Every structure is written in C-alpha cells, then in structure tokens.
Design an enzyme around this catalytic site. Structure first.
Site, PDB file in Angstrom:
ATOM      1  N   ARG A   1       0.837  -1.194   0.000  1.00 16.72           N
ATOM      2  CA  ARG A   1       0.000   0.000   0.000  1.00 16.72           C
ATOM      3  C   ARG A   1       0.878   1.251   0.000  1.00 16.72           C
ATOM      4  NH1 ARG A   1      -5.547   1.413  -0.922  1.00 16.72           N
ATOM      5  NH2 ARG A   1      -5.338   3.688  -0.666  1.00 16.72           N
TER       6      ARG A   1
ATOM      7  N   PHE B   1      -0.902   7.113  -2.520  1.00 15.95           N
ATOM      8  CA  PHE B   1      -1.641   7.432  -3.754  1.00 15.95           C
ATOM      9  C   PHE B   1      -2.203   6.212  -4.494  1.00 15.95           C
ATOM     10  CE2 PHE B   1       1.312  11.143  -3.402  1.00 15.95           C
ATOM     11  CZ  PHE B   1       0.337  12.110  -3.210  1.00 15.95           C
ATOM     12  N   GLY B   2      -1.897   5.006  -4.020  1.00 14.95           N
ATOM     13  CA  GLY B   2      -2.436   3.800  -4.642  1.00 14.95           C
ATOM     14  C   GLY B   2      -1.961   2.513  -4.006  1.00 14.95           C
TER      15      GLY B   2
ATOM     16  N   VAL C   1      -0.727  -1.478  -4.594  1.00 13.66           N
ATOM     17  CA  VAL C   1       0.029  -2.247  -5.586  1.00 13.66           C
ATOM     18  C   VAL C   1      -0.291  -3.730  -5.429  1.00 13.66           C
ATOM     19  CG1 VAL C   1       2.299  -2.712  -6.588  1.00 13.66           C
ATOM     20  CG2 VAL C   1       1.878  -0.538  -5.428  1.00 13.66           C
TER      21      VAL C   1
ATOM     22  N   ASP D   1      13.606  12.751  -4.838  1.00 12.65           N
ATOM     23  CA  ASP D   1      13.370  11.831  -3.717  1.00 12.65           C
ATOM     24  C   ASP D   1      14.198  10.545  -3.835  1.00 12.65           C
ATOM     25  OD1 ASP D   1      12.362  10.838  -1.291  1.00 12.65           O
ATOM     26  OD2 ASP D   1      10.345  10.492  -2.015  1.00 12.65           O
TER      27      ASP D   1
ATOM     28  N   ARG E   1      15.115   3.410   0.024  1.00 10.16           N
ATOM     29  CA  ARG E   1      13.706   2.947   0.018  1.00 10.16           C
ATOM     30  C   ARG E   1      13.022   3.057  -1.350  1.00 10.16           C
ATOM     31  NH1 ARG E   1      13.711   7.685   2.651  1.00 10.16           N
ATOM     32  NH2 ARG E   1      12.737   9.441   1.559  1.00 10.16           N
ATOM     33  N   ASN E   2      13.489   3.991  -2.179  1.00 12.47           N
ATOM     34  CA  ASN E   2      12.893   4.284  -3.481  1.00 12.47           C
ATOM     35  C   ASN E   2      13.589   3.633  -4.681  1.00 12.47           C
ATOM     36  OD1 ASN E   2      10.736   5.806  -2.453  1.00 12.47           O
ATOM     37  ND2 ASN E   2      12.013   7.650  -2.282  1.00 12.47           N
TER      38      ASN E   2
ATOM     39  N   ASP F   1      10.227   4.917  -8.091  1.00 12.25           N
ATOM     40  CA  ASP F   1       9.531   6.011  -7.412  1.00 12.25           C
ATOM     41  C   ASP F   1       9.573   7.339  -8.196  1.00 12.25           C
ATOM     42  OD1 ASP F   1       8.147   7.365  -5.265  1.00 12.25           O
ATOM     43  OD2 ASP F   1      10.108   8.191  -4.677  1.00 12.25           O
TER      44      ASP F   1
END
Ligand SMILES: Cn1cc(-c2ccc3nnc(C(F)(F)c4ccc5nc(NC(=O)C6CC6)cn5n4)n3c2)cn1
Ligand SMILES: [Cl-]
Length: 296
Positions: free
Chosen positions: A34, A37-38, A40, A140, A144-145, A158
C-alpha cells in the site's frame, strides 16, 4: 541561501503505452503493498504471460495520466524502473523479486560484501546518470525508493506514475507550505527553498551511499524536521560508516559540497565509484552496527 556554517493528438501519441483490457489480469486478492496514492497488486500481463506489479491509482487528470505515461515510457535503461504500460487508472510495472533496496540490505539473512554494496551504489549512479541526461530531476532519491530484481539489478524507481510516499516515517511537513518532504536526504539549499535540481539529487545520492554502507541505518537519528538545516550549518555531515572505505567517504563528502555547482556530476560519480568498486574482490563482509539496530 545560507551555505557557510553558522485531445486527438494525445490519444494517438499514447497508443504505444496502452495495454488492452483483456490482455492484463490484475490479481486484486494478492496485495503487494500500500502507498499514499495507490495500492500495488500482483498481475499477469498477456501470446506469452509475464509476471508484473500493478498499481491502482485513485478529465484534466486523465490527460495528465496519459501524458505521464508517454514520458515515462521513453525512459529505458537497465538501472531505471521501466513502464510496461498503462490501463484505464492502472500502472503496469515489472515485478521486483527482492523489493526495495533498503529492506534488502537490512535483512539479517542477507550477507552482503563491501563489493556488493558499492556495486549497488554504482548501479544507482548509472541510473541517475541516465535520468540526469534526460534532464529529469528525481527529487526523492533514497534507498527505500530503489528496487532490486531477481538478478540483483538495482532500478531507480519512485518516479512518474510510480511516485509515492512508500515509507511515511521519513517525510516531514513544512510548517508553512504543508509539503511532506524527505528532509534527511535533502540538500542544504532545498531545505531552505524547496527547489530541487540534479545537484540536489547528487546530495541525496551521497546519503544513499551512506545508507548502503550502513546496511540501511536511518540518517541522523532523532533529527527529523527542517531543524536538520541548523544541524548541518553547525559544520556537520554524516559520519563515515565502519565498513565504508576511505575513498568512498571522500566521494560522499563531495556529494554534500556546500556549493551545488561544485558537487560532482553523476557521470563523474559513475567514473569514481567504478574505480573504487574494481579494487574489491568480495572478501569484506559488511555487518550491521549494534547502535543502529531497531532505530527509526
Ligand atoms: C518500502 N517500499 C518501497 C517501495 C517501492 C519503492 C519504489 C517504487 N517504485 N514503484 C513502486 C511500486 F510500488 F510501484 C512497485 C513496483 C514494483 C514492485 N515490485 C515489488 N515487489 C515486492 O514488493 C517484493 C518483495 C516482495 C513491489 N513493487 N512496488 N515502488 C515501491 C515499496 N515498499
Ligand atoms: Cl569486498
């Protein structure tokens, strides 16, 4: 800033990005994760069947969704997450077997060497070199991205239609503008102006290198707001990790140069890191620091 220390054409143009409705199966009962904005989910893209990740987002917005799809479809590089296609608001992306890079390096069952982690950093630098050459500013960049596939190929992710706040812990609200920003990865100038450039991506990349060599420790423990600006302006930078070689720390310090224009390009970083990488043979195992275990 303080830097011294104190539409018919759009329809035709999007045709090569669109996936037909009956040629994609979205497994809504199999959630991957989760975001803000959406959500997955797992999916099967269809002859021949290929496994994929499908993000379900929430007329002007439809035009922008199609436009973002076209732009994102142009970015093709082994170290950048590719867009497989779109469906209408579904974003079809390749499934990344090993998830995000931060969770991968933190996992105690994985046994990375210095070479492995510098290798991941080198891959990120190649991805950013490509994106910077397209005049794309990420805004960003962080461990993590980025994501990791079944061959341990790192993909800068991302961005575009895949843009999200994937870990809410590391985004702080600016008291005036209300923007939720990744302050621990941001350049000194961006902290003050909230403007981003390729040179502010270089700063973030330095922090990402630090994350790699610490196996996913959080940067600056208990400095979580825009008060990071004050901290930095005392004449401070992230400390050298125990398993970070001296040359790579020198590279990190260049990424955090007070003057944006004096920071190295991603081309330069790819060059410098490739040299450092080539000196290692996979003999140095990197272990997690006792003082970073379990810390937010
Ligand atoms: C902490 N964190 C960061 C992310 C993140 C970061 C960047 C990003 N860019 N796009 C997406 C995505 F959400 F679209 C997506 C695309 C492909 C994919 N493959 C998997 N596979 C796994 O999770 C496997 C281990 C089981 C998940 N995704 N997610 N990102 C998701 C998720 N959590
Ligand atoms: Cl090594």
């Amino acid at each position: 800033t303080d830097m011294s220390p104190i539409n018919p054409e759009l329809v035709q143009a999007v045709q090569h990005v669109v996936i037909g409705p009956s040629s994609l199966i979205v497994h809504f009962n199999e959630v991957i994760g989760r975001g803000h904005f959406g959500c997955v989910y797992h999916g099967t893209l269809l002859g021949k069947k290929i496994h994929c990740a499908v993000k379900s987002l929430n007329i002007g917005e439809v035009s922008q969704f199609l436009t973002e799809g076209i732009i994102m479809k142009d970015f093709s590089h082994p170290n950048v997450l590719s867009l497989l296609g779109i469906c209408l608001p579904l974003v079809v992306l390749p499934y990344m077997k090993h998830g995000d890079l931060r969770n991968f390096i933190r996992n105690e069952t994985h046994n990375p060497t210095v070479k492995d982690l510098i290798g991941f950093g080198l891959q990120v630098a190649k991805g950013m070199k490509y994106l910077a050459s397209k005049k794309f500013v990420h805004r960003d960049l962080a461990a993590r991205n980025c994501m990791l596939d079944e061959k341990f190929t790192v993909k800068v992710a991302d961005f575009g239609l895949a843009r999200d706040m994937y870990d809410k812990e590391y985004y702080s609200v600016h008291n005036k503008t209300g923007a939720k920003l990744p302050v621990k990865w941001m350049a000194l100038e961006s902290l003050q102006t909230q403007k981003f450039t390729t040179k502010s991506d270089v700063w973030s990349f330095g922090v990402l290198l630090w994350e790699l060599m610490t196996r996913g420790a959080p940067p600056y423990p208990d400095v979580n707001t825009f008060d990071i600006t004050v901290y930095l302006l005392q004449g401070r930078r992230l400390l050298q990790p125990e398993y970070c070689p001296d040359p790579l720390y020198e590279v990190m310090l260049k990424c955090w140069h007070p003057k944006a224009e004096m920071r190295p390009s991603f081309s330069e970083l790819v060059s410098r890191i490739s040299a450092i990488f080539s000196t290692f043979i996979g003999e140095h195992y990197v272990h997690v620091n006792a003082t970073y275990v379990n810390v937010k």
